[PDB]
Write a protein that binds this DNA or RNA. Structure first.
Ligand SMILES: [K+]
Ligand SMILES: [Mg+2]
Ligand SMILES: [Mg+2]
Ligand SMILES: [Mg+2]
Ligand SMILES: [Mg+2]
Ligand SMILES: [Mg+2]
Ligand SMILES: [Mg+2]
Ligand SMILES: [Mg+2]
Ligand SMILES: [Mg+2]
Ligand SMILES: [Mg+2]
Ligand SMILES: [Mg+2]
Ligand SMILES: [Mg+2]
Ligand SMILES: [Mg+2]
Ligand SMILES: [Mg+2]
Ligand SMILES: [Mg+2]
Ligand SMILES: [Mg+2]
Ligand SMILES: [Mg+2]
Ligand SMILES: [Mg+2]
Ligand SMILES: [Mg+2]
Ligand SMILES: [Mg+2]
Ligand SMILES: [Mg+2]
Ligand SMILES: [Mg+2]
Ligand SMILES: [Mg+2]
Ligand SMILES: [Mg+2]
Ligand SMILES: [Mg+2]
Ligand SMILES: [Mg+2]
Ligand SMILES: [Mg+2]
Ligand SMILES: [Mg+2]
Ligand SMILES: [Mg+2]
Ligand SMILES: [Mg+2]
Ligand SMILES: [Mg+2]
Ligand SMILES: [Mg+2]
Ligand SMILES: [Mg+2]
Ligand SMILES: [Mg+2]
Ligand SMILES: [Mg+2]
Ligand SMILES: [Mg+2]
Ligand SMILES: [Mg+2]
Ligand SMILES: [Mg+2]
Ligand SMILES: [Mg+2]
Ligand SMILES: [Mg+2]
Ligand SMILES: [Mg+2]
Ligand SMILES: [Mg+2]
Ligand SMILES: [Mg+2]
Ligand SMILES: [Mg+2]
Ligand SMILES: [Mg+2]
Ligand SMILES: [Mg+2]
Ligand SMILES: [Mg+2]
Ligand SMILES: [Mg+2]
Ligand SMILES: [Mg+2]
Ligand SMILES: [Mg+2]
Ligand SMILES: [Mg+2]
Ligand SMILES: [Mg+2]
Ligand SMILES: [Zn+2]
Lengths: 61, 105, 159
RNA sequence: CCCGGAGUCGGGUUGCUUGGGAAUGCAGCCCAAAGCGGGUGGUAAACUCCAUCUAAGGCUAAAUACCGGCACGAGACCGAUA
RNA sequence: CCGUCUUGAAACACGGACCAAGGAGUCUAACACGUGCGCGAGUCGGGGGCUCGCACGAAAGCCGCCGUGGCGCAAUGAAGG
RNA sequence: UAGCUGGUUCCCUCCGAAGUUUCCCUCAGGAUAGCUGGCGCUCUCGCAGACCCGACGCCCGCCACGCAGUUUUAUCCGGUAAAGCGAAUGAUUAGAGGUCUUGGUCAACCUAUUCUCAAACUUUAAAUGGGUAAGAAGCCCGGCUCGCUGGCGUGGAGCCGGGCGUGGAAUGCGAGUGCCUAGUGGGCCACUUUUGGUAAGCAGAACUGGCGCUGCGGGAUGAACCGAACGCCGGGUUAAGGCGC
RNA sequence: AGUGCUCUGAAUGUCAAAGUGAAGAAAUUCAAUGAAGCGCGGGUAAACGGCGGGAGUAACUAUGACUCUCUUAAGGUAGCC
RNA sequence: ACAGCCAAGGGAACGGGCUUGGCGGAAUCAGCGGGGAAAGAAGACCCUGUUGAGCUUGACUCUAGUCUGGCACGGUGAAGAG
RNA sequence: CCGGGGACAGUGCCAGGUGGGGAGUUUGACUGGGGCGGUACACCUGUCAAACGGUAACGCAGGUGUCCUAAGGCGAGCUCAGGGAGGACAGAAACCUCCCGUGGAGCAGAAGGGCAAAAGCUCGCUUGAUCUUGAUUUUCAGUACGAAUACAGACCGUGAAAGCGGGGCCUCACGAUCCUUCUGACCUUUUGGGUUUUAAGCAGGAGGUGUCAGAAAAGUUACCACAGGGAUAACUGGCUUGUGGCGGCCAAGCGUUCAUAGCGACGUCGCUUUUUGAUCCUUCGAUGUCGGCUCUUCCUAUCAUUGUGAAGCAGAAUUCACCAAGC
RNA sequence: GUCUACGGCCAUACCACCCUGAACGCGCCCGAUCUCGUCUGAUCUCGGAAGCUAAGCAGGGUCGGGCCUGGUUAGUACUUGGAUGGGAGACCGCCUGGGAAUACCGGGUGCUGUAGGCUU
RNA sequence: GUCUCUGUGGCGCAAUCGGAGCGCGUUCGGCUGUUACCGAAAGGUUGGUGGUUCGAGCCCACCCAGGGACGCCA
RNA sequence: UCCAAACUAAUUU
């Protein structure tokens, strides 16, 4: 006939068995979702980044 | 609702805002040679009776109102469909309401 | 069963403080949010565009994106079994810089100030703050007085 | 000089059938042919080039099937409640 | 006092007098991953064929680019491509 | 045919659940994610110097990362409990002081007080709690790139060199990651908070622990209480509970 | 009145296939023409069935022959309880 | 199933067995109907199942039969009308 | 053959009607048992909810299937509810004027939040309620729809401009596949080539599934069947005791006087399990189900009898208590 | 010492009332040809410079009201953890840690940035 | 319990069409020797209480007084 | 051939 409707009993110890693991961040996260006008400048700031190795290497040395 | 029967909106054929003629969309008549109708009439032929489901519920009381929009630029006179929200009483080019006068005895 | 409405139960959360209604003070609009700084997400009620959902009110995340009026924050959210990082877009009325980081930036600027000046005095100065040691031995003067005797008061009944 | 199978093809429509989808085949019923014609050329139609075959008569071995029959041979089978 | 279903069985829940014997996750196909082996940008005869006379042998061997073909080595688009 | 009953055959070893989410003509079922096992793999500490033996480099000082049902130190977050009503909104008891009048001395009215309230009121406001942080993915120097931004050598992001280890709270701990995957999706009880009900060994939630899966000592007896969790034994000592027979 | 059954078919509204006409290169499309039936019109309850409420009123009171009314296809008659 | 004396407790909330008490003496005979929630029967009532069947109809799809139109068998003369 | 009909009837094939005579099938779910009622079946606000979020009951208080060429978008100028004091007719309400007025108004609607040179009211100009591709949020499996938020690219409106605007101040107002229809590309196929109709596609709207992740659906069975179910009702048992039954305490009153001989209002505290509700723990591979008859035993909350106490107990009869269930 | 323009935090800055305000400024003020608005040069817009600190504004004052901040309230209310504590219950003590709000009683009454004046 | 529904002048009862009426009665003249007919006038918290609204008897929420209908396996 | 009903209990010749 009727039955139990809802409970979160036992749930807090279910998901502590394999731990509640934090999201493992890494260096160099993804650029998915940044401003599109911002992002095509940065692709242009790296497309022309070789334009000036010779001035840069004759300035570290 | 009360939409006016002229409107400046975007015309995709020319890529500008152009004057349009707002007209209400009507469902055309069925083809009798379309592919789902030809499948349907082949499936109903013979013995077996009714083969596809017949709906007969009609929970809705309104329909979405679709406006066909035709641009009045004369050399390309393309048409666009435009849907607005559900409404019971739809008029088109009706009287503009105004806040001054007395209504009504 | 409750509704799954977007502002269910935010009667007091998204309201305003007492006698702090009205025009937003204008210096919440001229903060500067660089990418990668820690912001506290709160959420006003005076501004309805761009408010975060109620599960983020009082969380804290870092900035990954900056627009004209808003920001992109990476916030941890503990849904039932796992914490997953959420990317939310919030207009900058609803956030503020977190001062939880700035005490740590106060002492990183204090430690580099004292490592290139540590050696020439022979100083090995303490950098690791230690968790509140027990009290050391000391003396307590009576100054001729004697300590006041305390004794419990008798009971009496009013209310 | 001589050259070919008609209530048949084909069309409509109804029913079954098929992967056959604006109809693959088969049947009923109505209509009903042509002779440089006819059929086919997987989307219904008109137009036109091209390809392809010659329906409405007939015969035919082999390779193929075989829990019945006659007669054999064998088995990592069963061993008398099997 | 055992099997059983059940939140809960010694149960006034069900099945079971006793003994022997039989008695219930199989086989085929298709997939998926894991593992072992062989060959490796290839791989595989599975069908057919060739081989003292068919105890075993209805086995085993061989073919040659018989590699026809399958899968793999190229994707994407509804399609022209 | 059966989403329904019933049965389903040898032993030891290790690991060990779920009755919860979402969807379903779904409520005696399944899919879905949790929970389980197996197979691994990627790394770390390293093994420790034959018997030996703390060591063998640079007066000090130091001893890898990461991680956590935990605290500390910073710092945000909240409107419950309490309190409040001579604070708004509501509910509300009594006198008093004023005196204007479409009340008939009475009320109404006003001002200052006064009694008692609030799951769907609140100025105020805890305890417990929730989030983030506590470094090398850093810090300090130089330069370069940009089509973005622009009074400007601007602003911002990126890039390239160079320099800094006192490893920048405590305590504990080896960690990461992939594939395949069974069983479950009827739960029940107890402390505290809590809703409906006169109540119920009643119906429904929250938090944690337990029973289901689990024996043992104690409560005479008992799924769940109290103590304590289990290889087969000897000795010793306890727990809760006991000590007339 | 309802539901049936039945008669009538007038110029009758609706109304299939074929047929007729036009448009088109054709498939096709449109129009005209309109059988039964339905709709419209009568008849029929020893067909199926059906057959009300509310107020006021006699000179003691109480009743209510009478009166007024909403109302339906008729408002339950002779009888009997 | 094994069995067979009771009270009370606790317990799946009415025990032959368990706890605590009362107690318990072979082997049988005729009776008796308090118990064994005795036996007979996979509860008929009640509910559930995306299991049915008999029967009704204003359910949904059909259908024999009938009613009506069309074409065919299907012909010969007249008259009208177009 | 003789009569009688006769191109009608009839038969064959197609078409329309009628057709429970016959066939097949269906006849939701949740649910303090089921049915009836409701919809807790898709949504929204406040509360419950225990100060992050999440959180159930046929828990409470409500709402929703719409409305809007402005009630959308900008800009400007204004200030509201109410109160007071005045002003020909004019008063409880007409209009005029000054003063007070922190929102006590208003903002389409439910509630909650927001809002004052405004988000309100009034004028001006307008169509950003348009064309696009992704990312994100909310529900969440972290899938879809819906809704929403930040951008970016176009074209635009408004404003002197900064700017602001891709509907409604925010939280609700809505819908897959298949099919149909419409719009769009001097677009792709239409099967040996070509041309033209037709058809099929690609992309975006619409027509709708309210059982709202989306079957096409009426009853009855007492003539009934089957699989099961103590997951679930009816009798018995158990917990509870509102209700039923029986007592206590306090003392306004009644008792001609006099609270309490006998009583006992307004209150309030209990017991009992012969009632019935309430529940659903046990039994559905069955515990024979009301009453009477017969027969035994037990309870006491005593009707009588033995022994007593009290009286509004003269006697008689009667009433109130005690020990008491022997009979 | 103080103002002006533009602000930041938004009452310690607000409200009522009284007093003072040198010099600058800010205002009130005077006018309507132009610009631009009105029923109305009142507002708005424009052109001015006779008058005045009356008002705004500023500074001060009030056993002022509010507001800000301390004390008390009070280790009180409540609360984390704990017990084979108590009590028929309702509830209540203790252990271990945390710890409020009125009424009541004090104190306070704007700070400050950028640019430019004025004050002998 | 739930859902509909009625309420209006003395009486039965309209308009449900957001912008107060029939019939009958009662007064009051007439006609008549004197008590149908003719003439005219009067009369309504339109249940109550709040809402919504340019505006309510008509539309909403509640209360009342009445009605009606929806349930059965023991 | 339009409708057209009724008439102190209150007594004295
Ligand atoms: K019955
Ligand atoms: Mg469940
Ligand atoms: Mg047919
Ligand atoms: Mg077939
Ligand atoms: Mg073709
Ligand atoms: Mg042959
Ligand atoms: Mg034998
Ligand atoms: Mg034998
Ligand atoms: Mg045999
Ligand atoms: Mg033998
Ligand atoms: Mg059970
Ligand atoms: Mg057992
Ligand atoms: Mg039992
Ligand atoms: Mg059974
Ligand atoms: Mg048996
Ligand atoms: Mg055997
Ligand atoms: Mg393999
Ligand atoms: Mg089932
Ligand atoms: Mg079961
Ligand atoms: Mg709350
Ligand atoms: Mg409280
Ligand atoms: Mg179990
Ligand atoms: Mg304990
Ligand atoms: Mg009678
Ligand atoms: Mg027994
Ligand atoms: Mg017996
Ligand atoms: Mg059964
Ligand atoms: Mg059965
Ligand atoms: Mg089912
Ligand atoms: Mg059936
Ligand atoms: Mg029908
Ligand atoms: Mg039938
Ligand atoms: Mg049901
Ligand atoms: Mg909480
Ligand atoms: Mg404005
Ligand atoms: Mg744009
Ligand atoms: Mg607006
Ligand atoms: Mg061709
Ligand atoms: Mg019968
Ligand atoms: Mg039960
Ligand atoms: Mg009682
Ligand atoms: Mg007396
Ligand atoms: Mg239960
Ligand atoms: Mg029996
Ligand atoms: Mg029996
Ligand atoms: Mg007695
Ligand atoms: Mg002027
Ligand atoms: Mg002045
Ligand atoms: Mg002055
Ligand atoms: Mg003061
Ligand atoms: Mg009346
Ligand atoms: Mg029955
Ligand atoms: Zn155009």
């Amino acid at each position: 006939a009727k039955s139990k409707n809802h409970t979160t009993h036992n749930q807090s110890r279910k998901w502590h068995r394999n731990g509640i693991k934090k999201p493992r961040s890494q260096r160099y996260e993804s650029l998915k979702g940044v401003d599109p006008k911002f992002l095509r400048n940065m692709r242009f700031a790296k497309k022309h980044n070789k334009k000036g190795l010779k001035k840069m290497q004759a300035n570290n040395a | 609702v009360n939409v006016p029967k002229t409107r400046r909106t975007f015309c995709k054929k020319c890529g500008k805002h152009q004057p349009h003629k707002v007209t209400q969309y009507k469902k055309g008549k069925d083809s009798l040679y379309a592919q789902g109708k030809r499948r349907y009439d082949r499936k109903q032929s013979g013995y077996g009776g009714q083969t596809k489901p017949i709906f007969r519920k009609k929970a809705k009381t309104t329909k979405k109102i679709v406006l066909r929009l035709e641009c009045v630029e004369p050399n390309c006179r393309s048409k666009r469909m435009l849907a607005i929200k559900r409404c019971k009483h739809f008029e088109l080019g009706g009287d503009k309401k105004r806040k001054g006068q007395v209504i009504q005895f | 069963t409750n509704t799954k409405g977007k502002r269910r139960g935010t009667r007091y959360m998204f309201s305003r403080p007492f006698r702090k209604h009205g025009v937003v003070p204008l210096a919440t609009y001229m903060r500067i949010y660089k990418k990668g700084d820690i912001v506290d997400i709160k959420g006003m009620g005076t501004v309805q565009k761009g408010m975060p959902h109620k599960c983020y009110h009082g969380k804290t995340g870092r900035v990954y994106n900056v627009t004209q009026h808003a920001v992109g924050i990476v916030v941890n959210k503990q849904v039932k079994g796992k914490i997953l990082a959420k990317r939310i877009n919030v207009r900058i009325e609803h956030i503020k810089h977190s001062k939880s980081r700035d005490s740590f930036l106060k002492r990183v600027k204090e430690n580099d100030q004292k490592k290139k000046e540590a050696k020439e005095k022979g100083t090995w100065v303490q950098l690791k703050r230690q968790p509140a040691p027990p009290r050391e031995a000391h003396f307590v003067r009576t100054n001729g007085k004697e300590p006041e005797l305390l004794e419990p008061i008798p009971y009496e009944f009013m209310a």
